[PDB]
Amino acid sequence: RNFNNLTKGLCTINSWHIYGKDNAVRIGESSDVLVTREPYVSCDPDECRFYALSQGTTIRGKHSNGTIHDRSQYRALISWPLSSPPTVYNSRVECIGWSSTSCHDGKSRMSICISGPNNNASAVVWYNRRPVAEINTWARNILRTQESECVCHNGVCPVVFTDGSATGPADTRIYYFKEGKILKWESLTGTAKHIEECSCYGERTGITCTCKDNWQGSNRPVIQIDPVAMTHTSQYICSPVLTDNPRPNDPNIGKCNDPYPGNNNNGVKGFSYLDGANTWLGRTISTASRSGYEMLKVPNALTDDRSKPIQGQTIVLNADWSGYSGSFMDYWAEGDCYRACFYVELIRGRPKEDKVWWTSNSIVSMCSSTEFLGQWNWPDGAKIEYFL
Amino acid sequence: RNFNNLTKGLCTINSWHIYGKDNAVRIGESSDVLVTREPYVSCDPDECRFYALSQGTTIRGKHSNGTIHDRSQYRALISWPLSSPPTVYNSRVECIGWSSTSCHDGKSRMSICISGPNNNASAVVWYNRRPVAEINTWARNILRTQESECVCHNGVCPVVFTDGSATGPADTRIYYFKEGKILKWESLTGTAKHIEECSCYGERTGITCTCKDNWQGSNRPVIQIDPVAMTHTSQYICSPVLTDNPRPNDPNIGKCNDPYPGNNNNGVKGFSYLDGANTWLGRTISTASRSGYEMLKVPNALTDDRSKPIQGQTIVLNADWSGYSGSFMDYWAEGDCYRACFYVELIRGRPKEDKVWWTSNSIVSMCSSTEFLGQWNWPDGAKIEYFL
Amino acid sequence: RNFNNLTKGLCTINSWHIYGKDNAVRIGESSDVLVTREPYVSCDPDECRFYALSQGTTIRGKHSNGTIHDRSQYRALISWPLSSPPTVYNSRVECIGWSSTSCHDGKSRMSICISGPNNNASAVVWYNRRPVAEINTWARNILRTQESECVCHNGVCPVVFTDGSATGPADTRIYYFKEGKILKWESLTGTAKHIEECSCYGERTGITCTCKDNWQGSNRPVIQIDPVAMTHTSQYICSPVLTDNPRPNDPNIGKCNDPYPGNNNNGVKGFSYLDGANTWLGRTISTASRSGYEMLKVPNALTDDRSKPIQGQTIVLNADWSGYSGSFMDYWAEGDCYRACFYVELIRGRPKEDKVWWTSNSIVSMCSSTEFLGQWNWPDGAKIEYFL
Amino acid sequence: RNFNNLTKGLCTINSWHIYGKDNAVRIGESSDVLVTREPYVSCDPDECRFYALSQGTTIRGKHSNGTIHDRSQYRALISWPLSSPPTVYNSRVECIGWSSTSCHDGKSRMSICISGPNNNASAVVWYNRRPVAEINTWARNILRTQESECVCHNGVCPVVFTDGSATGPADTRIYYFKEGKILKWESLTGTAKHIEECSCYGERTGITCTCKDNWQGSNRPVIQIDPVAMTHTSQYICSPVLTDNPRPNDPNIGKCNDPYPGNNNNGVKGFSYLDGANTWLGRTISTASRSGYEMLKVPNALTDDRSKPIQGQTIVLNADWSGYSGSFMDYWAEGDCYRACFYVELIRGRPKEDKVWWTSNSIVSMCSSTEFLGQWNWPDGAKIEYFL
Ligand SMILES: *[C@@H]1O[C@H](CO)[C@@H](O[C@@H]2O[C@H](CO)[C@@H](O[C@@H]3O[C@H](CO[C@H]4O[C@H](CO[C@H]5O[C@H](CO)[C@@H](O)[C@H](O)[C@@H]5O)[C@@H](O)[C@H](O[C@H]5O[C@H](CO)[C@@H](O)[C@H](O)[C@@H]5O)[C@@H]4O)[C@@H](O)[C@H](O[C@H]4O[C@H](CO)[C@@H](O)[C@H](O)[C@@H]4O[C@H]4O[C@H](CO)[C@@H](O)[C@H](O)[C@@H]4O[C@H]4O[C@H](CO)[C@@H](O)[C@H](O)[C@@H]4O)[C@@H]3O)[C@H](O)[C@H]2NC(C)=O)[C@H](O)[C@H]1NC(C)=O
């Protein structure tokens, strides 16, 4: 086996096709399905799998009560076969904790989990299913990371972490790992003013991460990483097509180097593919809550502060609950280009559906097509009343 | 590994022996068995597996309510080990959608799933467990395909699709795939007037598909495909032994090039093995409903419009519910001939058994023997009353 | 891989040690454990597994009602990992039917299942998980076979079948298979007057089978098979230590060439290891019913009509229900001898425990030691009251 | 494959990081999780797994009633994937019995289980999943062994056994196995006065075991084994930091060659890493009961009868139930040193929580870091009230 190199460009994105869907909440009404949240997708050279943070209980289990909670000792990063639900019997534990990332470098997989109390959390870096390196909290305020896959080039796998305030300046670091060992880290540079939950993908240009500004911005910060030089830059998506949630209405001029104002101290993990005229942005349909999901083709969104959509695709109707979303690609697929993919977390239960005492989710996932495919919409599909 | 070539003839069929049976509905009364329909069987070079369209819920789950429905977002093609039931914990998702086919070419498996609304459906073609090609609806009216396995020769795997009316002329296409890529497609030619749900098998003569005419015919249309030239012909089974359901009583003269009249706008997926004096036809015993199943040896059924049975075998008693049936063979078995096999879907629940609110099925499967074996009958075996 | 040859003698048997136990009925009180009966054990070159005939329902499932029944369409030979219980999710179906045998030849496994009505049953012979040969009933009266493993030498695997009366002369045949194909069969010869459910093992001397005479005998018939010449002889165990059930009390003179009288038209599957001074016989402790199990060292039991025990070991107390028992060995273990092993079926439910409506079992298994080990007793361990 | 040699020293232990946690009792409230106790962890060259003694029933099963019991016929050593819970469907049975050890030698795994009545117990030694050797009780009083992993060097795997009184002088033996065969055994020598449940680890210095004195001592006995010479010595941890439970308060002078007095006829399995200035001891926080767990850095604890802690880490709060603890390491990890690891059994149910009728546990596990990591605490996390 050899380390994977990012040698291809993105395939032309003309629409999105269904890739995976687990119907976890439907099935979990009567099966031993683990309560999860913060899911993602990540590929090995021979298999692609679903990932999420378990809550250490099934949905029907009485311990599902209180699972709106973010950071218990009962959480772990688990993975399971593509489009199956996360069950007690099919889920593989990657590491223990309440914030994670994971990626395959072509030879083996690195997984990182953070655990601990708010003022004393630590990351453990696993490589080829063994713990290799550990990182202590540097700001003593909820050390946290991507909640979707990292990306590797020639064995080097950059990861974005943040430690510090969720509502003011924080201490963000980019770490560069190889075989689970720390090669280097650096403090965030550039014009992004707050960074959380980066969604990343790689292509010949380098590694691109679209993150969330939880503090003041409703445009998304972007970190661009060179995995060879092990350096990065940051800014915001310039486009006035705003993609955080909640968010103001779309103006006609966006902001490249500062948060677009209107909504403070909140946000949702999201993603984009920034590729000149082949640029597509994901966002919730609602500007107020985590409901609906759509993709919008916004040429040069990264650099053009006047850019608007010229094409789109609804993924989840506004009437249906969405949640976190993030990027991944099958770096080991055949062909001359990397096919852009993404997942959407479909959150069920609390806080929006409070007749149940749990919070969980299912997953839907799409990849790009060079065809102009007809669109459907993809709800979680569970009926809350059945759980009462 | 090499691509499989269709180098053998069919084994002489003198009777049928039990091959597989999953008892899924019996077991699912108290186990996490997924609700399915439209099942089939398909072999890899090292394993044969059961396939079906899941409904994204177990039978005992409250979401089983309403599963008579054909095309939800919660359906997926799943596969699972031969004669095991389709459980949450043992089922592998091949792709997402509500109409499917799948086949191994000797090197890897191609699976195709169609999803979408009626007017905007699309096929995604997967090869070696990755999405490779996509096909948009061409008639905007329920793009649909075989619901049983396709067949490959030297890497070329033909698949029959239909888009358009179920009750009038429609747009049927034969696609030719290799490694999931589209080599060619062509519009239906020949005398078949309506084509749905083709059941196919291969042998040195080429690929033979027995389909369903949903519009006017109660004889079955046949498509014969040359996978090297990538061309086909079509007609009907000439025999007056009629094999659709519902259907008129058997006359003494059949129809080779037009639908045999009497029953309109309905039908069931079925199959035959058309091999001169070694010809066997499957059909429901009832002419009115999907109940019973029998095999009948009808020499030269394809070409002889006077042909009648000379031997037969009951598979399912008329007192028991049947359903879809289709062909498959183990192309990788030892020996000098291909052993003909088939499955019968045993539908339980709605619409025929409406005291439950679900629709599901189990599977029984047979292969041919050169012996003249004694016959049994093979019911689903579940007691509906237990589910109340 | 090479075919296994029977090149070793039996290890000296000085006691028996615990080998496996699945506690299936205990666990099945609250888990998806399949109802079974007629279990056995059989080894591959890399793994040993438990085998049994499923009834196509779990114990807690409502379809467990009526499982005292021997021969439904819902039965199948399943296998599962050593000492695990037979669950819906871990059981591999080998073939469909209600009477079976199975054995590995060193390269692949042959499994045989018989299915059908009483007057029209048939065997299907599977090799390397594919159907290869079929055998129709020859006497039209419940074609039936060993219900424990067969044994192979240089690719030749003999199997004993019986078709015909259970209460008078029947038609017993010994078949010789290689790669699932029929090399030869022959009618029973020798002095055994009725043969059912042979338990077999192999060693340099050939293949030895201890069977059951269901008609008149309470001593056990023995068939000795030469797998090279493909010939056999038969007689009874000469010893007055009688080992069928039910049975008369032990006399002082046994019978070598005729049934020992007293009990007609009943019996239980059993086994022995016949090895001169290293001979050990298994039997139920009760002479009236299937309760208890003990091993007795009876020198030259096969040939000495006065032979009595000189050592023994209780396996199951008389207070606890037993059932079928049979022989197997790990032919692929290291060392200079084959270690004798056996299983005992521990039947729970009907007819003896009729407060439940089901019949099932668990398994306990022992192998021999050259040590003189202390003895325990090994009950099924389930409490019937829990199932009410 | 080659036998592993103990060529490395221990990594410097500056703190402990989370390694694994199964949340078994939480999950088992609504899933088919087996009741266990006496768990441990052990690595193969390609995977690390959790181990424990099953009770042959799930927690929700009615047979969980009475599982405080130590030695039934329904117990077995099982293993299952790291941090998954021990379920009916994912647990692999290693051998049958109620006292165990297991270890991989670099080529294959040896597992040992003891079963039998108190006066007639016996060990069966399994190697590469086959029974190889057996050892009869020598003192006829509950033959028993480590309840955590053994350690191997160049194919030789020492194991400590005890047979005889729990409350007076007993007969302890050290056995030396290779490929499951007995090379040698010897009677305990040295100054340790009573030995049970040794927790062992290996490094270039040899094999170090920290055991329990059940008779008079609240300091822990230590056995140091040379796996090449196949000889050993014994004494006690000299440190006045006492680590058994229950135990007296810590004095200022410990005892090197005799039990430290105050508590008789009780104890708990525990462990330490004895490595000069890199020495760390584990213990319950409570001196009265199995509650809490902490690690304490006690330089030269083995040899210094005045030694006190200079650093520590809380693992489980005193408010939470703990239980057995033991050592293991991944001998096949990359790097220049062996990373010390340990598990803590978190016992739930009887005798401390008697509103339920069962006794079970979950597992938490840590390994060492060269960083000074922030500490969390790791409770079982189940709510007993949910089980009522
Ligand atoms: C079968 O399936 C197919 C395939 O999926 C279906 O076809 C798809 O249909 C959907 C739905 O219509 C389309 O999505 C929309 O796309 C438009 C963009 O395309 C339009 O505009 C293009 C740009 O035009 C401008 O520039 C060009 C320069 O060339 C210039 O020519 C033009 O004059 C103008 O200046 C046009 O080029 C384009 O035309 C082309 O395509 C047509 C087909 O679509 C075709 O007929 C033409 O011939 C030509 O080829 C077309 O006119 C997106 O604008 C739109 O997204 C907006 O609207 C949705 C609601 O529908 C909303 O959710 C989005 O967020 C967005 O609107 C919000 O944001 C805007 C930007 O800030 C803002 O301006 C809006 O006011 C709005 O903002 C408000 O809401 C948001 C969200 O809550 C909030 O945040 C804000 O604050 C505020 O409150 C859709 O994405 C697909 O593109 C189309 N696909 C294809 C391949 O055709 C087909 O319908 C299905 N068939 C059936 C029968 O069902």
Ligand SMILES: *[C@@H]1O[C@H](CO)[C@@H](O[C@@H]2O[C@H](CO)[C@@H](O[C@@H]3O[C@H](CO[C@H]4O[C@H](CO[C@H]5O[C@H](CO)[C@@H](O)[C@H](O)[C@@H]5O)[C@@H](O)[C@H](O[C@H]5O[C@H](CO)[C@@H](O)[C@H](O)[C@@H]5O)[C@@H]4O)[C@@H](O)[C@H](O[C@H]4O[C@H](CO)[C@@H](O)[C@H](O)[C@@H]4O[C@H]4O[C@H](CO)[C@@H](O)[C@H](O)[C@@H]4O[C@H]4O[C@H](CO)[C@@H](O)[C@H](O)[C@@H]4O)[C@@H]3O)[C@H](O)[C@H]2NC(C)=O)[C@H](O)[C@H]1NC(C)=O
């Ligand atoms: C143990 O197991 C074994 C193995 O399974 C069992 O043996 C099997 O027994 C079954 C049941 O009998 C047989 O199936 C039937 O086969 C017959 C065909 O064979 C008969 O006819 C042959 C043809 O004869 C004609 O041509 C020859 C030319 O050679 C000429 O000689 C003759 O005069 C005549 O002109 C004969 O050759 C054949 O004889 C041979 O075999 C005999 C044994 O079967 C043997 O004894 C002889 O010596 C000789 O060797 C034999 O006579 C099928 O016709 C029949 O199928 C029809 O009937 C069933 C109901 O039973 C029905 O469901 C079928 O659909 C079909 O009838 C419908 O369709 C017809 C065609 O259109 C129509 O004409 C009918 O009116 C009817 O139509 C109505 O119903 C349908 C369905 O609902 C509806 O759609 C219509 O609209 C309409 O309403 C059976 O398949 C097996 O072949 C046989 N197997 C073997 C190897 O023997 C054995 O019984 C078991 N033992 C025990 C104790 O249980």
Ligand SMILES: *[C@@H]1O[C@H](CO)[C@@H](O[C@@H]2O[C@H](CO)[C@@H](O[C@@H]3O[C@H](CO[C@H]4O[C@H](CO[C@H]5O[C@H](CO)[C@@H](O)[C@H](O)[C@@H]5O)[C@@H](O)[C@H](O[C@H]5O[C@H](CO)[C@@H](O)[C@H](O)[C@@H]5O)[C@@H]4O)[C@@H](O)[C@H](O[C@H]4O[C@H](CO)[C@@H](O)[C@H](O)[C@@H]4O[C@H]4O[C@H](CO)[C@@H](O)[C@H](O)[C@@H]4O[C@H]4O[C@H](CO)[C@@H](O)[C@H](O)[C@@H]4O)[C@@H]3O)[C@H](O)[C@H]2NC(C)=O)[C@H](O)[C@H]1NC(C)=O
């Ligand atoms: C810790 O574990 C160890 C290891 O397991 C335990 O030790 C074991 O203890 C058990 C139980 O006692 C033993 O099993 C019994 O073995 C005897 C056979 O051994 C005895 O007889 C031998 C033969 O003696 C004859 O020939 C010799 C020639 O050398 C001659 O010297 C002698 O005079 C006589 O002529 C003796 O050699 C042997 O002595 C040796 O071993 C002794 C230890 O056992 C030792 O102390 C001596 O020093 C010497 O070394 C010994 O005396 C079996 O006969 C017996 O089986 C019968 O009884 C059981 C009930 O207990 C019954 O279930 C059996 O079916 C059988 O009895 C039935 O069948 C008979 C034959 O037809 C019949 O005659 C009986 O009347 C009876 O028939 C009735 O019941 C059956 C069944 O329902 C029914 O079908 C009939 O119709 C009828 O109704 C046991 O198998 C183990 O051998 C022994 N193992 C070892 C290694 O020691 C130890 O106890 C445990 N410790 C503790 C504290 O628990």
Ligand SMILES: *[C@@H]1O[C@H](CO)[C@@H](O[C@@H]2O[C@H](CO)[C@@H](O[C@@H]3O[C@H](CO[C@H]4O[C@H](CO[C@H]5O[C@H](CO)[C@@H](O)[C@H](O)[C@@H]5O)[C@@H](O)[C@H](O[C@H]5O[C@H](CO)[C@@H](O)[C@H](O)[C@@H]5O)[C@@H]4O)[C@@H](O)[C@H](O[C@H]4O[C@H](CO)[C@@H](O)[C@H](O)[C@@H]4O[C@H]4O[C@H](CO)[C@@H](O)[C@H](O)[C@@H]4O[C@H]4O[C@H](CO)[C@@H](O)[C@H](O)[C@@H]4O)[C@@H]3O)[C@H](O)[C@H]2NC(C)=O)[C@H](O)[C@H]1NC(C)=O
């Ligand atoms: C974020 O996470 C980090 C990392 O985990 C947290 O930092 C950790 O904090 C914990 C809790 O405080 C520390 O654990 C304790 O460690 C001390 C040992 O360190 C102290 O003592 C050292 C030795 O000093 C002596 O020798 C030196 C020689 O150099 C000499 O200088 C000195 O004068 C004295 O003579 C000091 O070196 C050390 O200082 C160093 O570290 C400091 C930080 O800790 C730092 O600030 C300094 O600058 C310097 O660098 C420090 O003073 C353990 O003693 C202690 O364990 C005892 O207490 C706990 C309860 O807390 C108890 O459970 C233990 O069993 C034990 O006490 C029992 O046993 C004793 C021995 O017999 C006995 O004397 C006690 O009376 C007591 O006995 C009673 O209870 C037991 C148990 O029930 C019973 O059996 C008996 O019978 C009896 O009833 C803790 O382990 C970590 O070391 C520390 N880690 C690090 C890297 O800093 C941080 O707090 C977190 N942040 C936040 C905000 O939460």
Ligand SMILES: CO[C@@H]([C@@H]1OC(C(=O)O)=C[C@H](NC(=N)N)[C@H]1NC(C)=O)[C@H](O)CO
């Ligand atoms: C604390 O809230 C953070 C994250 O919030 C989100 C969410 O659904 O909004 C869930 C994450 N939950 C988990 N990863 N478990 C939180 N992140 C953490 C570390 O709690 C937020 O981005 C502000 O810093």
Ligand SMILES: CO[C@@H]([C@@H]1OC(C(=O)O)=C[C@H](NC(=N)N)[C@H]1NC(C)=O)[C@H](O)CO
């Ligand atoms: C019919 O009874 C036969 C077998 O009886 C036994 C039993 O528990 O006694 C179960 C077998 N059940 C199964 N193998 N399924 C039967 N054997 C058969 C073929 O029914 C008997 O040996 C007489 O011929």
Ligand SMILES: CO[C@@H]([C@@H]1OC(C(=O)O)=C[C@H](NC(=N)N)[C@H]1NC(C)=O)[C@H](O)CO
């Ligand atoms: C009998 O008690 C012994 C062991 O006690 C412990 C315990 O939780 O205290 C459980 C073990 N349970 C199991 N290993 N099953 C016992 N050990 C045995 C062999 O029962 C003790 O160390 C005195 O000899």
Ligand SMILES: [Ca+2]
């Ligand atoms: Ca924001």
Ligand SMILES: [Ca+2]
């Ligand atoms: Ca029709």
Ligand SMILES: [Ca+2]
């Ligand atoms: Ca008898």
Ligand SMILES: [Ca+2]
């Ligand atoms: Ca003690």
